[PDB]
Design a protein around this ligand. Structure first.
Ligand SMILES: Nc1ncnc2c1ncn2[C@@H]1O[C@H](COP(=O)(O)OP(=O)(O)OP(=O)(O)O)[C@@H](O)[C@H]1O
Ligand SMILES: Nc1ncnc2c1ncn2[C@@H]1O[C@H](COP(=O)(O)OP(=O)(O)O)[C@@H](O)[C@H]1O
Ligand SMILES: Nc1ncnc2c1ncn2[C@@H]1O[C@H](COP(=O)(O)OP(=O)(O)O)[C@@H](O)[C@H]1O
Ligand SMILES: [Zn+2]
Lengths: 370, 379, 120, 370
C-alpha cells in the first residue's frame, strides 16, 4: 500500500501504487474569484481547485502554482495536495507513504520545501522524490535508452544506459506546452480571434490538444496552407461561436523544433536530444539512438515521432539506425513508471522515513534523491 | 433569535414582511401624507438634501414598522433589499435612519438581482429588472454579480406613464357631463400619476412581435398608405366621477411599443439582455443564456414575457448579434412568487438563514464605531 | 456548512498555530433547480377584438392588497382577513419609561401612566 | 509622386490628419459617425443621415453617436470609409486623395485582416499613389528625438507598452491590454449613476468623456482620499444644469492602475510598463527604465506621472533610476512622429506603390511594414 502523486505543471496525476492507470487526473490550478465589494451568493468556496475550477472558469482567475517545474506559490500547492489526498483519492496521508515527482536540474529549495510540507503538514510516514525521466523508462520495460520527456512546464533529456544515468549529459529546456499555448494565442490574435484572460487561455489549450499536428516539412506545409483550404479545420468554443484556425494549426507545434519563433535563442527539442547523446560516452551512443523514448503530453502531437526521426537522422551519422519509442499511453508515462517502482520490494528500502527526516533534517532528501 | 424583517424601498411600491414566508405581508405605494400637502410626497427621491430625505424615510419606516407590520424595531434584524448602483447618499441615509433613530440590531444591503436568483434555486442566471425608474440587467454567475457587464435604459414605469399621458392629450375625448357628450380635448392640463397607472394596468396590453412590428412602421408612416393592424375596441374610463375619458384602441397597444422600439441607437428592453450577454466572458455565455430571469412589475403587463423572448430571438438573427449569440437557446425561468415580489422573496429566503445573516450583516456596534457602510466602491 | 467553515477558520486564526495538523482533517440535501420553459404562454387572442369591462378587471390598489397571488380578474380575487391595529407605548433616550396603555385598550380611554406637556 | 504625403493617425477616440510639412496636425476631429436619434421619415429634420466631426459637435444632442473603431480594431468598415472620405472633404485638408501619398498608424499586435482591409480601401476606393502602415509606438520616439525608449501609449481604445533600444524593437516584449480611456469613460458613467446622475444615451456618453477629460485626478494614495471628505466640485453641462461629481472623480481613472476592482482580468498600466521591461534582456533593463516615454491622451490625467513613478518604483528593482519623460504634446505626439518620418527621404523607399500591390499580392503591405 503506497501513493504515487505526479506534480506536473499542467496536470497532477495521482493514484495508488500497483494500479494500471492513475485514479484521479485533474488540471493543477487554483481558482480565486474576481470578487467586487458586492455580497456573494450561497454555496461559495473561498478558493476552488482542479475539475471544480475547470467547471467555474468564467469568473475565477486561473493561477498555475508550478511555473517551469518550480513551485512559485507553496500555499497554492498545499491546497492542491489537500484536494489530491482527502477529496480526489479519498485516503489519509498519515496511513500511506507518498512518492512525488520533480523535473531534473530544478532549484534545490524546490525538493527541500516539497518534502518539508509532506513530513510536517500532511505527516506522511515516508517520502521519496524521483526524476520524471527515470520513471518514464519503466513504462516501456526498457532499462537502456534516452527519453525526451516534454511536459507542460518543462522538457528534459535524461540518458540512462543499463540502469545507470549520466547526470552531466542531462539538458533542460524551458520551452514547453504552456509556452506553445501562449504562442498559439498570439498567432490566433493575428488571424482575428482574440484570447486574453486566464479562462480564455484554458480554451486555447483545448483547441491546441485537438487540432494542432506536427508537419514533416514546415516550408512545404506553409505552401499547401496558402494555396488550398484543406488544412483549415473548424472548432466550436464553449460559446456557440465557431472559429477556423487555418495554417496556425501546424505553426504552433513548429515552435518545439525551432524556438526562434517563440524567440528564446535556444536549440530545438530535436537538436537538444542529439546534443545530450553527443555529451554521453562514444560507445553507449548506439543504444541511445536505437532507444529514444518520447514521454509527457507534449509528445502526443499527431506525427511528432515522424518529424523527430527525420531531424535526428539528419544530425546523426548515416550508418546509425534511429528508432523513436512512442507508446499509446505517453500522457500517463511518468505515473505508470512510479506505480511499477513503488510496487517493487527493492524500493521498500529506498524510502526516506520520518525518523530519518527528524534527526538529519530536510537536507537528507539531496543525498537520497537519485 | 427572532424572524428578521425584509424591506425593499422602491420609487413606485415598497415590499414589506417577515423572513421564511411565501410572499410579502404588506405592499403599498412608497409615499407619505404630510399635513398641508394635497398630493403625498414620494419617500425615495435621488439628488436632494440629506436632512429632507432623512425626515421622509423616518416618517415612512415608522408607518411600515407599526401600521403595516406590528413589531418592535430594536428587537429583530433587518434585510434591506436595494438594486445595485443605488445612489450612495440615499443608501447611506437609509442605514443612518435604521441605526440612529430606530436602533436596529443589524442591516444587510442585499442586491435585488442576486436575491431574485435564490428564489429559483439555480446558482447562475441572467436577471432583467424592469422597474419604475430604469430597466436594469446584471448577469449573476454562481453567486458572483458581474458589474463589468452591467446594462440599464430608462424604459420602465415612469417612461411608460409619461408616454401614455402624451398620447391621451393628443387624442383627448372626455364626457365632462356639461354638454361634453361631443369630444372635448384637454379640459385638464395634466392627468394625475395615480389615474395613468390604473389605465396602464387595466386597459393597455403588450402586442405580439408580428403585430407590434407593423404598429412601429404604421405610426412612422414610412412611404405607405394606412398599413396598420385593426385595433381593439375603445374603453371608456371614469375621471373624478362625472368626467368619462374615452381611451382610443390605438393608444392601448402603441404606448408599450416605446420599450421595444429600436429608435436607431438599437437600445430596447429586449436588446439590453443581448448587449450585456455579448460583453460577458466567453465561458459563461451558454449557461447565462439558458437561465433568464424577468423580475419587476413592468414585466407583469399582459403578454410582455412572450414579446420579449420573441423580440430577443428576432434581434439574435440581426447581423450585430448573429456572430456571437447566433446558435444560443434562450429559455425563461418561472419564479415561485409573482414578478413584482421575486426580489422580496429572496431576502426572506436569505433572512431565514439566521447563522449566515448575523455574520454577513453590518452590526450597529460596528456602524457607531466606524460610521462607514461597506459598498462595491473602494474603501 | 459556511458557519462551520467560518468557525473553524476563525478559531485557527485565534489559536495562531499556523494550521498545525494535530489530528486528521475533513447525508446531503440536493434541491433540483427549476426547469426553464422553451416558450412562455402567449397573450390569448381574446384580448384582440373584445370589449374590456373595467368592472370585471381589478384596479392596482385592490390587486396589491392580495399580494401572494394578485389576480387580474375579480372572480379570482378572494376577501382577505381584517388587519390588526397597534397600541403604541413611548420610551425616551435619557429617561426610561414615560407613558403606556392598559391590557384592555379595547373599549377603554384610560392611561396606565398619564403623561403629556399640557398636563404639566 | 513628389507632392507632400498626408499623415493620418487611426486613433479610436480622435483621428488626427494633416500634411507632413506642418509641425502640428491642422485638422483633428472626433472619430465617430453621427446619425439622427429619431428615425427620420419627415422633412425639416437633419438631412443626409451623416454628421462627422465639427458638424456632429454642433447638433450633438439630436444625433446618435456610433464609434466605428473599438479596441484598435475596425468593426464597421462602411462607417470608417465615410470618416476617411471626410478627411478628404472641403471641411478638412480640401485635396484629392489620388494625388498625395498616405501614412497610417495602426496599434501594435492588431489582426492582419484589419491591416489588409485598411490597405484595400485606401488603394481601391481612394486611388492613393502609395500607402505605409506603421506602429504607433515607433513614431512617438521620432517626435521626442531619441532612438532608445519604452513607449507606454495609452490611447482611447487600447493601451500598449513597446520597448525599443537603439532603433531595435523586441517584438516578444510588446504588451497590449484593452483597458484604455474608453473603458475609464464607461466605468465613470457607472460611478456617476452611483452618485445618482444617469447618462443612458449614446450622446450623453460623450459628455461623460468631457466630464472625465475636465475633472478626474489620480490620487497618490487612493485609500486616504476615500476616508477624507470630498469638496464635491460642480461641473456645468451643455444644457446649463450643475452636477456634483464628488468621490467618483478620483476612483474612476484608478481602474487603469487596478482593473481587478470593477472585475476586468488585466495586468494594469503600471504592470504592463514594468513587465515589458522585465520581459526584455537583463543588460537593457536599466537603460529602458532610464528612458520611458508617455504617449496618447489617457496619460494626461492630473497626477498620472506622479502615481506611475510610485507604482513602478515598488515593482521595479531597488536603487534603479526611473525617468518617465512625458512631452508637452502627448495627445499629438504619435502624429508629429509620422510627420517627421514622412518628411525623410528614407520614407520614399519604405512605402508600397499602387502598381506594387497589384503585382506582388496581399503580403506586400505586411512584409514592408517593418
Ligand atoms: N493530445 C495532446 N496533443 C497535444 N498537446 C497535448 C495533448 N495532451 C496534452 N497536451 C499538452 O501538453 C501538456 C501535457 O501535460 P501532461 O498531462 O503530460 O502533464 P505535465 O504537467 O506535463 O506532467 P509531466 O511534466 O510529469 O509530464 C498539456 O498541458 C497540454 O498543453
Ligand atoms: N401587478 C402589476 N400589474 C401590472 N403592472 C404593475 C403591477 N405591479 C406594478 N406594476 C407597474 O410596474 C411598476 C413596478 O415598479 P416596482 O418594481 O414595484 O418598483 P421599483 O422598481 O422602484 O422597485 C409599477 O410602478 C407599476 O406601474
Ligand atoms: N486632457 C485630457 N485629460 C484626460 N484625458 C484626456 C485628455 N485628452 C484626452 N483624454 C482621453 O484620451 C483620449 C484620446 O486618446 P488619443 O491620444 O487620441 O489616442 P490615440 O493615440 O489612439 O490617437 C480621449 O478620448 C480621452 O478619453
Ligand atoms: Zn427625559
Amino acid at each position: 500500500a503506497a501513493l504515487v502523486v505526479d506534480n506536473g505543471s499542467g496536470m497532477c496525476k495521482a493514484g495508488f501504487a500497483g494500479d494500471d492507470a492513475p485514479r484521479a487526473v485533474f488540471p493543477s490550478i487554483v481558482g480565486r474569484p474576481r470578487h467586487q465589494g458586492v455580497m456573494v451568493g450561497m454555496g461559495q468556496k473561498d478558493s476552488y481547485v482542479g475539475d471544480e475550477a475547470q467547471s467555474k472558469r468564467g469568473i475565477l482567475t486561473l493561477k498555475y502554482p508550478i511555473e517551469h517545474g518550480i513551485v512559485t506559490n507553496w500555499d497554492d500547492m498545499e491546497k492542491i495536495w489537500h484536494h489530491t489526498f482527502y477529496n480526489e483519492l479519498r485516503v489519509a496521508p498519515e496511513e500511506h507513504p507518498v512518492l512525488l515527482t520533480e523535473a531534473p536540474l530544478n532549484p534545490k529549495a524546490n525538493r527541500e520545501k516539497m518534502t518539508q510540507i509532506m513530513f510536517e503538514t500532511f505527516n506522511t510516514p515516508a517520502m521519496y522524490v524521483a526524476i520524471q525521466a527515470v520513471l518514464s523508462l519503466y513504462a516501456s520495460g526498457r532499462t537502456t535508452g534516452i527519453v525526451m520527456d516534454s511536459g507542460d512546464g518543462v522538457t528534459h533529456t535524461v540518458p540512462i544506459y543499463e540502469g545507470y544515468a549520466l547526470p552531466h549529459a542531462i539538458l533542460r529546456l524551458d520551452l514547453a506546452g504552456r509556452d506553445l499555448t501562449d504562442y498559439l494565442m498570439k498567432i490566433l490574435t493575428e488571424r482575428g480571434y482574440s484570447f486574453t484572460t486566464t479562462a480564455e487561455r484554458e480554451i486555447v489549450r483545448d483547441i491546441k490538444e485537438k487540432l494542432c499536428y506536427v508537419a514533416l516539412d514546415f516550408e512545404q506545409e506553409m505552401a499547401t496552407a496558402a494555396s488550398s483550404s484543406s488544412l483549415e479545420k473548424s472548432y466550436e468554443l464553449p460559446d456557440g461561436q465557431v472559429i477556423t484556425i487555418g495554417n496556425e494549426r501546424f505553426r504552433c507545434p513548429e515552435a518545439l523544433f525551432q524556438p526562434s519563433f517563440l524567440g528564446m535563442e535556444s536549440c530545438g527539442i530535436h537538436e537538444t536530444t542529439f546534443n545530450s547523446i553527443m555529451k554521453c560516452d562514444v560507445d553507449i551512443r548506439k543504444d541511445l539512438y536505437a532507444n529514444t523514448v518520447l514521454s509527457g503530453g507534449t509528445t502526443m502531437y499527431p506525427g511528432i515521432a515522424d518529424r523527430m526521426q527525420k531531424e535526428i537522422t539528419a544530425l546523426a551519422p548515416s550508418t546509425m539506425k534511429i528508432k523513436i519509442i512512442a507508446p499509446p499511453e505517453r500522457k500517463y508515462s511518468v505515473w505508470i513508471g512510479g506505480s511499477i517502482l513503488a510496487s517493487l520490494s527493492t524500493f521498500q528500502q529506498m524510502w526516506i522515513s520520518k525518523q530519518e527526516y527528524d534527526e538529519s533534517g530536510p537536507s537528507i532528501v539531496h543525498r537520497k534523491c537519485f | 433569535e427572532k424572524t428578521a424583517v425584509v424591506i425593499d424601498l422602491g420609487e413606485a411600491f415598497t415590499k414589506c414582511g417577515f423572513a421564511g414566508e411565501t410572499g410579502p405581508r404588506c405592499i403599498i405605494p412608497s409615499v407619505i401624507k404630510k399635513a398641508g400637502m394635497p398630493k403625498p410626497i414620494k419617500v425615495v427621491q435621488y439628488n436632494i438634501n440629506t436632512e429632507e430625505l432623512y425626515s421622509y424615510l423616518k416618517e415612512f419606516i415608522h408607518i411600515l414598522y407599526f401600521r403595516h407590520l406590528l413589531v418592535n424595531p430594536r428587537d429583530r434584524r433587518v434585510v434591506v433589499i436595494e438594486s445595485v448602483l443605488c445612489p450612495s447618499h440615499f443608501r447611506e441615509t437609509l442605514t443612518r435612519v435604521l441605526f440612529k433613530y430606530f436602533e436596529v440590531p443589524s442591516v444587510l444591503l442585499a442586491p435585488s438581482h442576486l436575491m431574485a436568483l435564490l428564489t429559483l434555486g439555480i446558482n447562475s442566471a441572467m436577471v432583467l429588472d424592469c422597474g419604475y425608474r430604469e430597466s436594469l440587467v446584471l448577469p449573476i454567475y454562481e453567486g458572483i454579480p458581474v458589474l463589468n457587464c452591467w446594462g440599464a435604459l430608462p424604459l420602465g414605469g415612469k417612461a411608460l406613464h409619461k408616454e401614455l399621458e402624451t398620447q391621451l392629450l393628443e387624442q383627448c375625448t372626455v364626457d365632462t357631463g356639461a354638454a361634453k357628450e361631443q369630444s372635448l380635448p384637454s379640459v385638464m392640463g395634466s392627468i394625475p400619476e395615480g389615474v395613468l397607472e390604473d389605465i396602464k394596468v387595466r386597459t393597455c396590453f403588450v402586442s405580439d412581435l408580428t403585430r407590434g412590428l407593423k404598429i412601429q412602421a404604421a405610426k412612422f408612416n414610412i412611404d405607405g398608405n394606412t398599413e396598420r393592424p385593426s385595433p381593439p375596441p375603445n374603453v371608456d374610463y371614469p375621471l373624478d366621477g362625472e368626467k368619462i375619458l374615452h381611451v382610443l384602441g390605438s393608444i392601448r397597444d402603441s404606448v408599450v411599443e416605446i420599450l421595444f422600439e429600436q429608435d436607431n441607437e438599437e437600445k430596447s428592453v429586449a436588446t439590453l439582455i443581448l448587449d450585456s450577454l455579448m460583453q460577458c466572458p466567453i465561458d459563461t455565455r451558454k449557461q447565462l443564456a439558458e437561465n433568464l430571469v424577468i423580475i419587476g412589475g413592468t414585466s407583469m403587463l399582459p403578454g410582455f414575457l412572450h414579446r420579449l423572448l420573441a423580440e430577443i430571438r428576432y434581434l439574435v438573427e440581426k447581423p450585430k448579434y448573429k456572430k456571437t449569440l447566433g446558435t444560443k437557446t434562450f429559455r425563461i425561468h418561472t419564479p415561485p412568487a409573482k414578478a413584482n415580489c421575486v426580489a422580496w422573496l429572496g431576502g426572506a429566503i436569505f433572512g431565514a438563514l439566521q447563522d449566515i445573516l448575523g455574520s454577513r450583516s453590518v452590526s450597529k456596534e460596528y456602524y457607531n464605531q466606524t460610521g462607514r457602510i461597506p459598498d462595491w466602491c473602494s474603501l | 456548512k459556511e458557519k462551520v467553515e467560518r468557525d473553524r477558520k476563525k478559531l485557527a486564526r485565534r489559536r495562531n498555530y499556523m494550521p498545525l495538523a494535530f489530528s486528521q482533517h475533513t447525508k446531503e440535501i440536493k434541491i433540483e433547480p427549476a426547469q426553464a420553459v422553451d416558450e412562455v404562454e402567449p397573450l390569448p387572442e381574446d384580448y384582440y377584438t373584445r370589449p374590456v369591462n373595467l368592472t370585471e378587471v381589478t384596479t392596482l390598489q385592490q390587486r396589491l392588497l392580495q399580494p401572494d397571488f394578485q389576480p387580474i380578474c375579480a372572480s379570482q380575487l378572494y376577501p382577505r382577513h381584517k388587519h390588526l391595529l397597534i397600541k403604541r407605548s413611548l420610551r425616551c433616550r435619557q429617561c426610561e419609561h414615560n407613558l403606556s396603555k392598559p391590557e384592555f385598550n379595547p373599549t377603554s380611554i384610560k392611561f396606565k401612566i398619564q403623561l403629556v406637556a399640557v398636563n404639566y | 509622386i513628389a507632392n507632400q504625403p498626408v499623415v493620418i493617425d487611426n486613433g479610436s477616440g480622435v483621428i488626427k490628419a494633416g500634411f507632413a510639412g506642418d509641425q502640428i496636425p491642422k485638422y483633428c476631429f472626433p472619430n465617430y459617425v453621427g446619425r439622427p436619434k429619431h428615425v427620420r421619415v419627415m422633412a425639416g429634420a437633419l438631412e443626409g443621415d451623416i454628421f462627422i466631426g465639427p458638424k456632429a459637435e454642433e447638433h450633438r444632442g439630436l444625433l446618435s453617436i456610433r464609434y466605428p473603431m473599438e479596441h484598435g480594431i475596425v468593426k464597421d468598415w462602411n462607417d470608417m470609409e465615410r470618416i476617411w472620405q471626410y478627411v478628404y472633404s472641403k471641411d478638412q485638408l480640401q485635396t484629392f486623395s489620388e494625388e498625395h501619398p498616405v501614412l497610417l498608424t495602426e496599434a501594435p499586435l492588431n489582426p492582419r485582416k484589419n491591416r489588409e482591409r485598411a490597405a484595400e480601401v485606401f488603394f481601391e476606393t481612394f486611388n492613393v499613389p502609395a500607402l505605409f502602415i506603421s506602429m504607433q509606438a515607433v513614431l512617438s520616439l521620432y517626435a521626442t528625438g531619441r532612438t532608445t525608449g519604452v513607449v507606454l501609449d495609452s490611447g482611447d481604445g487600447v493601451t500598449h507598452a513597446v520597448p525599443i533600444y537603439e532603433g531595435f524593437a523586441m517584438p516578444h516584449s510588446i504588451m497590449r491590454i484593452d483597458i484604455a480611456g474608453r473603458d475609464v469613460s464607461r466605468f465613470l458613467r457607472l460611478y456617476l449613476r452611483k452618485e445618482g446622475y444617469d447618462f443612458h444615451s449614446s450622446s450623453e456618453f460623450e459628455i461623460v468623456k468631457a466630464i472625465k477629460e475636465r475633472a478626474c485626478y489620480l490620487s497618490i494614495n487612493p485609500q486616504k482620499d476615500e476616508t477624507l471628505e470630498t469638496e464635491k466640485a460642480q461641473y456645468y453641462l451643455p444644457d446649463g444644469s450643475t452636477i456634483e461629481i464628488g468621490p467618483s472623480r478620483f476612483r474612476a481613472p484608478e481602474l487603469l492602475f487596478r482593473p481587478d476592482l470593477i472585475g476586468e482580468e488585466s495586468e494594469g498600466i503600471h504592470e504592463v510598463l514594468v513587465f515589458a521591461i522585465q520581459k526584455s534582456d537583463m543588460d537593457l533593463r536599466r537603460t529602458l527604465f532610464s528612458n520611458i516615454v508617455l504617449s496618447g491622451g489617457s496619460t494626461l490625467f492630473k497626477g498620472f506621472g506622479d502615481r506611475l513613478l510610485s507604482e513602478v518604483k515598488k515593482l521595479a528593482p531597488k536603487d534603479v533610476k526611473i525617468r518617465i519623460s512625458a512631452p508637452q504634446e502627448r495627445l499629438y505626439s504619435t502624429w508629429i512622429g509620422g510627420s517627421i518620418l514622412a518628411s525623410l527621404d528614407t520614407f520614399k523607399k519604405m512605402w508600397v506603390s499602387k502598381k506594387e500591390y497589384e503585382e506582388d499580392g496581399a503580403r506586400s503591405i505586411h512584409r514592408k511594414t517593418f
